[PDB]
Design an enzyme around this catalytic site. Structure first.
Site, PDB file in Angstrom:
ATOM      1  N   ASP A  62      19.106 -21.007   7.197  1.00  0.00           N
ATOM      2  CA  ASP A  62      17.754 -21.353   6.754  1.00  0.00           C
ATOM      3  C   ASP A  62      17.681 -22.864   6.598  1.00  0.00           C
ATOM      4  O   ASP A  62      18.046 -23.388   5.553  1.00  0.00           O
ATOM      5  CB  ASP A  62      17.433 -20.723   5.388  1.00  0.00           C
ATOM      6  N   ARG A  70      20.014 -25.937   3.758  1.00  0.00           N
ATOM      7  CA  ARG A  70      21.376 -25.611   3.308  1.00  0.00           C
ATOM      8  C   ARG A  70      22.357 -26.755   3.483  1.00  0.00           C
ATOM      9  O   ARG A  70      23.304 -26.875   2.729  1.00  0.00           O
ATOM     10  CB  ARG A  70      21.956 -24.412   4.079  1.00  0.00           C
ATOM     11  N   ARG A 130       6.816 -24.822   1.156  1.00  0.00           N
ATOM     12  CA  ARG A 130       7.508 -24.448   2.395  1.00  0.00           C
ATOM     13  C   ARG A 130       6.504 -24.154   3.494  1.00  0.00           C
ATOM     14  O   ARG A 130       6.868 -24.042   4.669  1.00  0.00           O
ATOM     15  CB  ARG A 130       8.391 -23.226   2.187  1.00  0.00           C
ATOM     16  N   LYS A 160       8.171 -16.822  10.380  1.00  0.00           N
ATOM     17  CA  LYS A 160       8.244 -15.991   9.179  1.00  0.00           C
ATOM     18  C   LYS A 160       7.130 -16.377   8.219  1.00  0.00           C
ATOM     19  O   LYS A 160       6.627 -17.490   8.282  1.00  0.00           O
ATOM     20  CB  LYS A 160       9.610 -16.141   8.513  1.00  0.00           C
ATOM     21  N   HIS A 161       6.720 -15.475   7.331  1.00  0.00           N
ATOM     22  CA  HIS A 161       7.319 -14.154   7.150  1.00  0.00           C
ATOM     23  C   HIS A 161       6.247 -13.131   7.431  1.00  0.00           C
ATOM     24  O   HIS A 161       5.406 -12.865   6.585  1.00  0.00           O
ATOM     25  CB  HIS A 161       7.777 -13.983   5.699  1.00  0.00           C
ATOM     26  N   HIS A 170       6.011  -6.510 -10.407  1.00  0.00           N
ATOM     27  CA  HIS A 170       7.047  -6.077 -11.338  1.00  0.00           C
ATOM     28  C   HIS A 170       7.760  -4.801 -10.888  1.00  0.00           C
ATOM     29  O   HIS A 170       8.180  -3.992 -11.719  1.00  0.00           O
ATOM     30  CB  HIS A 170       6.471  -5.902 -12.747  1.00  0.00           C
ATOM     31  N   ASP A 239      14.590  -7.793   7.047  1.00  0.00           N
ATOM     32  CA  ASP A 239      14.850  -8.572   5.858  1.00  0.00           C
ATOM     33  C   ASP A 239      16.284  -8.255   5.432  1.00  0.00           C
ATOM     34  O   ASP A 239      16.954  -7.421   6.040  1.00  0.00           O
ATOM     35  CB  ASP A 239      13.858  -8.179   4.750  1.00  0.00           C
TER      36      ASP A 239
HETATM   37  C1  LIG Z   1      10.877 -14.581  -0.877  1.00  0.00           C
HETATM   38  C2  LIG Z   1       9.942 -15.385   0.021  1.00  0.00           C
HETATM   39  C3  LIG Z   1      10.270 -15.130   1.489  1.00  0.00           C
HETATM   40  C4  LIG Z   1      11.635 -15.725   1.776  1.00  0.00           C
HETATM   41  O1  LIG Z   1      11.939 -16.814   1.317  1.00  0.00           O
HETATM   42  N1  LIG Z   1      12.465 -15.005   2.531  1.00  0.00           N
HETATM   43  C5  LIG Z   1      13.791 -15.500   2.867  1.00  0.00           C
HETATM   44  C6  LIG Z   1      14.895 -14.544   2.484  1.00  0.00           C
HETATM   45  N2  LIG Z   1      14.831 -14.001   1.334  1.00  0.00           N
HETATM   46  O2  LIG Z   1      15.757 -13.238   0.932  1.00  0.00           O
HETATM   47  C7  LIG Z   1      15.700 -12.483  -0.327  1.00  0.00           C
HETATM   48  O3  LIG Z   1      14.764 -12.668  -1.100  1.00  0.00           O
HETATM   49  N3  LIG Z   1      16.704 -11.623  -0.564  1.00  0.00           N
HETATM   50  C8  LIG Z   1      16.828 -10.788  -1.695  1.00  0.00           C
HETATM   51  C9  LIG Z   1      15.782 -10.644  -2.613  1.00  0.00           C
HETATM   52  C10 LIG Z   1      15.942  -9.792  -3.709  1.00  0.00           C
HETATM   53  C11 LIG Z   1      17.133  -9.077  -3.893  1.00  0.00           C
HETATM   54  C12 LIG Z   1      18.174  -9.214  -2.973  1.00  0.00           C
HETATM   55  C13 LIG Z   1      18.016 -10.063  -1.875  1.00  0.00           C
HETATM   56  O4  LIG Z   1      16.079 -14.326   3.308  1.00  0.00           O
HETATM   57  C14 LIG Z   1      16.152 -14.877   4.627  1.00  0.00           C
HETATM   58  C15 LIG Z   1      17.614 -15.161   4.916  1.00  0.00           C
HETATM   59  O5  LIG Z   1      18.276 -15.850   4.140  1.00  0.00           O
HETATM   60  C16 LIG Z   1      15.259 -16.113   4.793  1.00  0.00           C
HETATM   61  O6  LIG Z   1      15.355 -16.616   6.138  1.00  0.00           O
HETATM   62  C17 LIG Z   1      13.814 -15.785   4.380  1.00  0.00           C
HETATM   63  O7  LIG Z   1      12.898 -16.859   4.688  1.00  0.00           O
END
Ligand SMILES: CCCC(=O)N[C@H]1/C(=N/OC(=O)Nc2ccccc2)O[C@H](CO)[C@@H](O)[C@@H]1O
Length: 322
Positions: A62, A70, A130, A160-161, A170, A239
């Protein structure tokens, strides 16, 4: 290439990582900050990933700029996607950001960044700056620029997304209850119709007006809409499935059935191993279109006036609006 993207613990491959990368269900490795110490170490890690796999394999990260980059130390800092449209030459600067981000990843043996963000608006705390803009034309105008920069250095693109995470204000899963999301979806439609997206990542968001399933696991969203109505031809990601459907294998299976070509399992090595162990092997030959199309080192890159300028310009832009 198999369907599964997974991740490793740190800076070097362990014995277990090596055995994992050899498994033909693996199709890609997603990298995080924790896999990055310095430029040299990163090249060394990516070369080890490619050796361990002994077949073509994807390496992704990312790297959007701003809140999501990163690899920062030893790289040019890329501004929040939001900044471009705020400069007086936003299209010009957004193409510079895209090319520069993509070019430095490539110099370090990374195939792709999961970008651009095509979500609209800043009100969703997790998206925020973003996003390229707050309206259809600003997003399209500036994400297209960014995306043209990626393409110019031979990097595949991932919108995305899908179908749009910009309005989430919640349960185990976020909701967007608007009875229409046409404007948000119009952005994705234009980029698909323009043939500029090699891949698509869906949102983990339920749109109750439309379907009960989060889009990332929705037959409606991933097949009826994404494929049928919009004609997307590229790679559909899931996802992160490590996070109803059952265990890892069933979750992976529902994601593939729902219309994903590839599935991601991050931050849970034992769920990934359970999938490697138990899922029948499938090939994803069309994921080879995601392999970077160019090859060069960092010091070769820095000889381009294009690099000297984009780099100075991105730093300037960050200073301007920070
Ligand atoms: C949450 C807003 C959308 C987002 O940021 N999604 C990212 C994303 N988000 O991941 C999660 O939120 N994972 C997660 C959430 C809750 C519990 C466990 C994992 O994962 C991808 C890989 O790293 C990214 O490329 C996505 O852009």
């Amino acid at each position: 290439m198999g369907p599964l993207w997974l991740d490793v613990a740190g800076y070097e491959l362990s014995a277990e990582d090596r055995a994992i990368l050899a498994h033909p269900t693996v199709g890609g490795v997603i990298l995080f900050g924790r896999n990055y110490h310095d430029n040299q170490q990163l090249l060394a890690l990516n070369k080890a990933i490619r050796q361990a796999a002994a077949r073509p394999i994807l390496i992704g990260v990312d790297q959007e700029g701003g809140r999501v980059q990163r690899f920062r130390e030893g790289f040019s800092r890329i501004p929040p996607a939001q900044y471009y449209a705020r400069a007086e030459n936003g299209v010009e600067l957004a193409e510079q950001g895209g090319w520069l981000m993509a070019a430095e990843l490539i110099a370090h043996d990374v195939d792709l960044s999961f970008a651009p963000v095509l979500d609209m608006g800043f009100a969703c705390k997790a998206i925020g700056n973003r996003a390229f803009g707050e309206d259809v034309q600003t997003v399209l105008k500036h994400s297209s620029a960014f995306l043209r920069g990626m393409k110019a250095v031979g990097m595949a693109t991932t919108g995305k997304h899908f179908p749009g995470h910009g309005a989430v204000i919640h349960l185990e899963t976020p909701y967007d209850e608007r009875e229409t999301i046409a404007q948000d979806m119009a952005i994705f439609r234009a980029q698909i119709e323009a043939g500029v997206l090699d891949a698509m990542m869906p949102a983990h968001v339920v749109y109750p007006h439309y379907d009960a399933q989060p889009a990332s696991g929705s037959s409606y969203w991933l097949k009826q809409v994404l494929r049928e109505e919009l004609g997307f031809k590229g790679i559909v990601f899931s996802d992160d499935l490590s996070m109803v459907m059952g265990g890892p294998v069933e979750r992976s299976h529902q994601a593939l059935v729902a219309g994903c070509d590839m599935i991601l399992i991050c931050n849970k090595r034992e769920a990934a191993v359970e999938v490697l162990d138990n899922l029948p092997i499938m090939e994803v030959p069309q994921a080879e279109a995601l392999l970077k199309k160019q090859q060069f080192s960092y010091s070769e890159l820095k000889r381009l006036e294009r690099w000297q300028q984009a780099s100075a310009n991105m730093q300037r832009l960050i200073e301007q609006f920070s």
